[PDB]
Amino acid sequence: AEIGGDHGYNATNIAAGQTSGAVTQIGPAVMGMVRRAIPNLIAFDICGVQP
Amino acid sequence: FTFKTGATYAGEAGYVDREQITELTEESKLTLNKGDLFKYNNIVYKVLEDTPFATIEESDLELALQIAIVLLKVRLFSDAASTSKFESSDSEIADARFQINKWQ
């Protein structure tokens, strides 16, 4: 009669793996990284260039 | 842990049976009789000779109990359950528990 438990849903426990149950998981897997998008240039046609 | 205790929870010892079994205390060690079970440090024992701890002068109980085993006053009750124990449809069947902790 053994309990698997849940993390407290506290973001502190879930990241450490603390668990009320029998097992403390290694950690929170990974779902991948979310970067921030690189915003766009307006290019230079709007103004004469002349390198 | 299983390996530290020295006690057997699956057998004629049982677990819920260890409730009705009376621990050794300085008062209770005097009242033991032949065939009376007792647990100390959760290791159940069985009394071979009535009024054990009559000739044993050790005030310290842990070692007095430990020199009863060698003088065969009380044996260790690790013992296998007679088959009729688990068939009664009321059966306390020993539970086996684990815990998994990480060291990070």
From Swiss-Prot, chain A:
A proteolytic cleavage by the prohead core protein protease gives rise to the mature major capsid protein during virus maturation. It comes from the Viruses. Belongs to the Tevenvirinae major capsid protein family. Major capsid protein that self-associates to form hexamers, building most of the capsid in association with pentons made of the capsid vertex protein and one dodecamer of the portal protein. The major capsid protein self-associates to form 160 hexamers, building most of the T=13 laevo capsid. Folding of major capsid protein requires the assistance of two chaperones, the host chaperone groL acting with the phage encoded gp23-specific chaperone, gp31. The capsid also contains two nonessential outer capsid proteins, Hoc and Soc, which decorate the capsid surface. Homohexamer. Interacts with the portal protein. Interacts with the capsid vertex protein that forms pentamers. Interacts with hoc; one hoc molecule associates with each capsid hexamer. Interacts with soc; this interaction reinforces the capsid structure. A total of 960 subunits of the major capsid protein forms the 160 hexamers. This is Major capsid protein. The gene is gp23.
UniProtKB/Swiss-Prot annotation, chain B:
Keywords: Capsid protein, Late protein, Virion. The chain holds residues 64 to 167 of 427 of the full protein. Belongs to the Tevenvirinae capsid vertex family. GO terms for cellular component: viral capsid. This is Capsid vertex protein. Transmembrane segments: none annotated. Homopentamer. Interacts with the portal protein. Interacts with the major capsid protein that forms 160 hexamers. Capsid protein that self-associates to form pentons, building the capsid in association with hexamers of the major capsid protein and one dodecamer of the portal protein. The capsid vertex protein self-associates to form 11 pentons, building the T=13 laevo capsid in association with 160 hexamers of the major capsid protein. Proteolytic cleavage at the N-terminus by the prohead core protein protease gives rise to the mature capsid vertex protein. It comes from the Viruses.
